[PDB]
Design a protein around this ligand. Structure first.
Ligand SMILES: [Zn+2]
Ligand SMILES: [Zn+2]
Ligand SMILES: [Zn+2]
Lengths: 288, 309, 135, 60, 74, 63, 166, 214
């Protein structure tokens, strides 16, 4: 077993969408080049402030399989290290990433070589063949444990977060707006209401968890979890919200405005269809 | 097949580069398809900049009348927007970057250059035009991409343009819709001038697995409050501009039709008028679907939250 | 909100009087106290009448309307005044911003509650995992 | 003479080392660079004399 | 040397004032107007004015909108 | 009253107290009213055109 | 003295006394009296300005040329004080402005009418109740007008095209 | 520091009790900061006070936990006389209960439920409650309204657990109904797309048939 049991995260890891973007692109191209989903290996860079680690960017590494062992071209990694120096100074190496499922007895070999380079590398593994609705990205750290009298390096899962800036947020929001359309338009409202469906599902799952906790407290658990059940009941008392004449008036105002806009759009489509029909009819029987 | 575009066919690219069909037509390249990765990287770099122009190189390929951008990378250069062919200062760097990229399986070569216009739209100035002209003198298939990171944020819609220059002495044909941009006083003067000067490439893009990963992750959490109001279209600048352009286009169509009623036997005029009317109708329609989807999301969510029980 | 008993300690510290060489502009203390009391008024009060505002500031309503007028002119306090009714409309976030902020605060409080149950009660996290695996 | 102008107010908020200095004319008068810039667009006659207000210095 | 330096900034004072919002200078087009304006003055100095329009780095602090030809200038 | 009938005064006459009150109509209400009128006229013209197409396709004309 | 009055008349917002006048031509006794006038002009102290005019009338409007321009100068400064003051408090009673300006109510009404007709005031006057109602223009519209114009113009366009093609 | 002071008194209540506990509870009602009294009520020594001879302080504490100011006015004979701090704290709690139901509170309701005569002191009490981070909101004086955006919650007598369960069940049922409606919209949109594709393929088949005919 390469996974440590009972070991909690010692540092906080912040991940950016660009890192996941690099991993996905690396896996796709290698799959396209060599058929099956060939495992990819790259490196992680970013800023580290004490125990707070922020992974802002990531890049690829050259590796070779010799004696059924993955040998990372650290010389290429070092050649690429000064290459990224020429563009960015504030970004420092933080760890390496790969693709696959559970850790295999080859990633430990990769990690020990990366641990040789720097003081403390971070290990990230992405699962491109996942089927659940959760993020198939996990961050692991290096821990030394005495197993059967021998010091064996293990991986401890880290409770990383997803940190992003206003820029990236707006950018990917409009990337989703652009995916809402396309050359091969299958459906648009389908994707829209599927997105709302996923959001409502997340909220419903939260409500189910709260209700289950309340029922358990009624049965066992803590009879009163203090501020938690207090705030839960208060929020359930704010569920009605209560609108005023002005809010309903403004809601109906916006609805009427955009409905009039929709009516105008339907009129435009209908008049275009009428123009096409008239153009065809003027050729069907009419002259001049 | 969603991932078919990611397949690189080197011999096919060599065949296209030997054929040079763009020499037969200065309007040959009409479409620009951009991957998610490239666009995201570019936007991020430009916003880190903040109010200063940055630039980089785009890696990709060609496919018929379509230019395809697969990836991009920043260039460590000074004088973007002031120096003609500023990219030249990064020549050595570009050679090494690409060499190292080829070592890790990046097979696509240089397809263009991108740079930012923070808060002044997306167009080609006299300098940009000189640079892209030189970039289309030695590397004819080159696309210039311009991004406004500031207007992207303020408008809530990606502000990007793809452009190609005309050779010295060559005049554009009759068509040129030219969407108006709110560039500053003298910047807009020069903008009208260079919109008359170059030609834009229809933004096409492609939904892929890169896009699938992004849309899914950001919507889950950055949109825990999937609210974000619901109408970033409330700003009467984009929809209003589209409405005004629609009105101008249909007014010009009517003006053409009125004069065309006296000439008996002009089929081309009828064809052009019908096509213009159809294009205007589709533009208005797509605006209508956008508004309707916005209102639908708004209605469902606000009804649920305000009056669930 | 600043009342009239904090004046004594601050005034003594300033310059055994007021920090400069005296203030005499109704004291720079009270000028800032009134100015802050208008900011604190701007945070809550959607609108305010002349008499009620003046009693809050411990000044005549004629003084209250003038300083509020001055702050609006300088842009340090948003709003408008109506002299007929004698009421100053400080701030109202229409209907959409208020609703959006309320929804965002509700979602943030829900997330805080979920995090608190997960942290303070890991047994709840185990029970939730068991329940989601059962169903 | 220093300490910013009416068009700039505070020191920070996108100043980049405060790109607003004092400008000197041939008539030896001194004002802010931005203040005369707004003056020079409408009129051009150096409101303290009747010299044409050449540009002889930047900063103090 | 002083009068030669006087020539070198007077052309730049004139160039950023005239090609500000006149016609179009894609390459060496509107520059002929400035040479005609300074024809009765001194030599057109083509090479000098051609490297000095790009050499508008008079602000070392800069860190703001760069000197894009005459757009940044008044 | 003559000026209001001709226009360019945009006012209403209150003959009770003899006070001339200016008219400031809501843009949105007039816009919605005339948009509904335009839609009704468009539907009527569409019906007219469909009837014209029906009578032309079936060759209906007075001999 | 003529130049200082001329600088006032052009509604200039720059101290003419600053440096060329320096002190010999900024603190000369009668010139210093003129310095107080432009100082009140900068501060828009209408009450103080009129007090100095009446105090030094033997050297203020003594010149027949200046005496002609005192009425216009008073009109301008009263307008500037009015324009500066009226920014807040829409729907103000007229007599309050008259007391603040220390002038008659009829003069305030005439000045208000001139300011509105110059497009400097976004509002109208209620002469029945002695009231000045200012348009707050908080609707934030002017786009529905463009939408309606576009709708009507292009729908008439479509109707004309259909009629001509049929 | 109210929570730390609350916990210290909880630890002290585990030991010393009686008249000292009642005086300690009175100090809690007088010391500003404490806005939640549910944790105190669940101490075993509070239950010891239930069977104890003294009940005025317990009925006092019980009212602060569940009752409001008008109930306290009704019980001015069975409750120990409060201080100025105790009265203000109860008035803040009553405002919390009022703000919990309605997010907009007219000044008429404020003057009625709280025995408020002078409107000036009403504003002073409102701002005092807000500045101690009790209620977040906005005051409308032209309409004489109190718009409260956010407020702290209150305690439960374990009989509202059924109401909480019912509310959560209603929320779950509404969410499930919206999910089912969204799925029905999926089906309807897919059916419309299929109908459009059927029309397109019918047109293509008709065109191909005519091409074969000629
Ligand atoms: Zn550019
Ligand atoms: Zn400045
Ligand atoms: Zn000067």
């Amino acid at each position: 077993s390469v996974m440590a049991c009972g070991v909690t995260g010692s540092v906080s890891v912040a991940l950016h969408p660009l890192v996941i973007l690099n991993i996905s692109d690396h896996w796709i191209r290698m799959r396209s080049q060599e058929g099956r989903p060939v495992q990819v290996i790259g490196a992680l860079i970013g800023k580290q402030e004490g125990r707070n680690i922020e992974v802002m960017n990531s890049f690829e590494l050259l590796s070779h399989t010799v004696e059924e062992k993955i040998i990372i071209d650290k010389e290429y990694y070092y050649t690429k290290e000064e290459q990224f120096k020429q563009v960015f100074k504030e970004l420092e190496f933080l760890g390496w990433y790969t693709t696959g499922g559970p850790p295999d007895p080859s990633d430990i070999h990769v990690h020990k070589q990366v641990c040789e380079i720097i003081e403390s590398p971070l290990f990230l593994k992405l699962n491109p063949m996942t089927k659940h609705t959760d993020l198939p990205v996990s961050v692991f750290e290096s821990v030394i444990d005495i197993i059967n009298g021998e010091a064996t390096m293990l991986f401890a899962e880290l409770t990383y977060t997803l940190a992003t800036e206003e820029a990236e947020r707006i950018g990917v929001d409009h990337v989703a707006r652009m995916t809402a359309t396309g050359s091969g338009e299958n459906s648009t409202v389908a994707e829209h209401l599927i997105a709302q469906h996923s959001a409502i599902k997340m909220l419903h799952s939260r409500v189910k968890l709260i209700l289950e906790y309340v029922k358990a407290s009624e049965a066992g658990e803590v009879p009163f979890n203090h501020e938690i059940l207090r705030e839960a009941y208060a929020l359930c008392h704010c569920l009605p919200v209560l609108s005023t004449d002005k809010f309903k008036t403004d809601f109906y105002d916006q609805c009427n405005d955009v409905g009039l806009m929709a009516y105008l759009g339907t009129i435009t489509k209908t008049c275009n269809t009428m123009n096409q029909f008239v153009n065809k009819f003027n050729v069907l029987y009419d002259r001049q | 097949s969603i991932d078919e575009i990611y397949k690189y066919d080197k011999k096919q690219q060599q065949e296209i580069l030997a054929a040079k069909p763009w020499t037969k037509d200065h309007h040959y390249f009409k479409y620009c398809k951009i991957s998610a990765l490239a666009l995201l990287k570019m936007v991020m770099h430009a916003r880190s900049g903040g109010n200063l122009e940055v630039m980089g190189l785009m890696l990709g390929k060609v496919d018929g009348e379509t230019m395809i951008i697969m990836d991009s990378f920043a260039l460590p250069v000074e004088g973007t927007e002031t120096r003609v062919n500023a990219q030249a200062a990064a020549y050595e760097y570009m050679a090494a970057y690409i060499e190292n990229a080829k070592q890790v399986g990046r097979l696509e070569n240089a397809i263009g250059w991108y740079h930012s216009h923070p808060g002044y739209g997306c167009w080609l100035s006299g300098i940009d035009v000189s640079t892209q002209m030189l970039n289309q003198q030695f590397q004819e298939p080159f696309v210039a991409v311009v991004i406004d990171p500031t207007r992207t944020i303020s408008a809530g819609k990606v502000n990007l343009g793809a452009f190609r220059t005309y050779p010295k002495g060559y005049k554009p044909p009759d068509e040129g819709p030219s969407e108006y941009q709110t560039i500053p006083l003298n910047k807009i003067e020069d903008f009208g001038v260079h919109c008359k000067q170059y030609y834009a490439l229809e933004v096409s893009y492609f939904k892929s697995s890169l896009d699938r990963k992004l849309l899914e992750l950001l919507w889950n959490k950055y949109w825990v409050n999937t609210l974000s109001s619901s109408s970033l279209l409330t700003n009467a600048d984009y929809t209003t501009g589209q409405v005004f352009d629609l009105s101008e286009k249909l007014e010009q169509s009517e003006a053409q039709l009125g004069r065309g009623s006296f000439m008996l036997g002009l089929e081309t005029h009828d064809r052009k008028s019908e096509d213009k009317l159809a294009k205007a109708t589709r533009d208005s329609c797509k605006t209508t679907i956008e508004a309707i989807h916005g209102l639908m999301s708004q209605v469902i969510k606000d009804k649920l939250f305000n009056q669930i029980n | 909100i600043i009342r009239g008993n904090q004046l004594q300690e601050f005034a003594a510290m300033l310059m055994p009087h007021q920090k400069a060489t005296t203030a005499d502009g109704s004291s720079i203390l009270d000028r800032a106290v009134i100015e802050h009391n208008l900011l604190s008024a701007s945070k809550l009060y959607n609108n305010i009448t002349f008499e009620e505002l003046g009693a809050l500031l411990e000044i005549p309503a004629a003084k209250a309307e003038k300083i509020a007028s001055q702050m609006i002119t300088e842009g340090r306090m948003n709003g408008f005044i109506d002299q007929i009714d004698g009421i100053v409309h400080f701030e109202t976030r229409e209907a959409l911003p208020t609703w959006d902020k309320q929804i965002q605060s509700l979602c943030f409080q829900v997330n805080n509650l979920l995090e608190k149950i997960s942290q303070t009660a890991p047994e709840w996290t185990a029970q939730a995992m068991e329940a989601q695996m059962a169903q | 003479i220093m300490d910013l102008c009416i068009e700039c107010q505070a020191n920070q908020a996108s100043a980049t080392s405060e790109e607003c200095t004092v400008a000197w004319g041939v008539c030896n008068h001194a004002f802010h660079f931005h203040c005369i810039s707004r003056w020079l667009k409408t009129r051009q006659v150096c409101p303290l004399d009747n010299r044409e207000w050449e540009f002889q210095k930047y900063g103090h | 040397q002083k009068v030669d330096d006087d020539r070198k900034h007077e052309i730049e004072a004139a160039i950023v004032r005239i090609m500000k919002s006149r016609k179009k200078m894609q390459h060496n087009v509107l520059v002929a107007e400035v040479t005609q304006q300074l024809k009765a003055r001194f030599l057109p100095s083509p090479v000098v004015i051609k490297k000095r329009i790009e050499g508008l780095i008079e602000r070392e602090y800069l860190a703001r909108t760069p000197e894009d030809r005459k757009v940044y200038t008044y | 009253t003559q000026l209001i009938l001709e226009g360019l005064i945009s006012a209403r006459v209150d003959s009770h107290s003899k006070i001339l009150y200016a008219r400031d109509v809501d843009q949105r209400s007039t816009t919605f009213e005339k948009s509904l009128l335009m839609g009704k006229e468009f539907q009527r013209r569409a019906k007219a055109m469909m009837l014209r197409a029906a009578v032309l396709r079936n060759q209906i004309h007075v001999k | 003295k003529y130049l200082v009055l001329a600088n006032m008349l052009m509604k200039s917002g720059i101290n003419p006394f600053d440096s060329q006048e320096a002190k010999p031509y900024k603190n000369d006794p009668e010139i210093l009296a003129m310095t107080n006038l432009v100082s009140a002009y900068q501060n828009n102290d209408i009450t103080e300005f009129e007090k100095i005019l009446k105090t030094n009338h033997s050297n203020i409007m003594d010149d027949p040329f200046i005496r002609e321009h005192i009425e216009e100068l008073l009109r301008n400064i009263r307008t500037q004080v009015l324009i500066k003051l009226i920014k807040p408090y829409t729907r103000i009673h007229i007599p309050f402005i008259s007391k603040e300006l220390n002038i008659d109510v009829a003069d305030v009404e005439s000045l208000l009418v001139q300011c509105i007709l110059d497009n400097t005031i976004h509002g109208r006057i209620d002469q029945v109740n002695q009231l000045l109602e200012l348009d707050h223009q908080k609707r934030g519209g002017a786009r529905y007008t463009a939408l309606d114009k576009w709708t009507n113009q292009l729908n008439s366009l479509n109707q004309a095209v259909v009629s001509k093609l049929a | 520091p109210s929570s730390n002071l609350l916990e210290q008194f909880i630890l002290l209540a585990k030991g010393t009790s009686g008249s000292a506990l009642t005086a300690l509870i009175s100090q809690v009602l007088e010391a500003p900061g404490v806005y939640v009294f549910g944790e105190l009520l669940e101490l075993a020594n509070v239950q010891e006070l239930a069977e104890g001879a003294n009940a005025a302080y317990l009925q006092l504490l019980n009212l602060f936990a569940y009752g409001t100011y008008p109930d306290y006015i009704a019980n001015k004979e069975s409750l120990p006389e409060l201080s100025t701090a105790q009265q203000n704290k109860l008035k803040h709690l009553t405002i919390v209960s009022l703000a919990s139901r309605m997010k907009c509170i007219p000044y008429s309701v404020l003057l009625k439920d709280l025995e408020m005569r002078n409107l000036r002191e009403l504003e002073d009490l409102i701002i005092e409650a807000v500045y101690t981070d009790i209620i977040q909101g906005k005051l409308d004086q032209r309409n004489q309204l109190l718009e409260v955006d956010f407020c702290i919650g209150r305690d439960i007598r374990k009989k509202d657990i059924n109401n909480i369960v019912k509310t959560l069940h209603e929320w779950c049922d509404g969410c499930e109904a919206v999910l089912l409606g969204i799925e029905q919209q999926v089906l309807r949109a897919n059916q419309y797309k299929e109908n459009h594709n059927r029309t397109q393929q019918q047109v293509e088949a008709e065109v191909t048939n005519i091409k074969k005919t000629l």
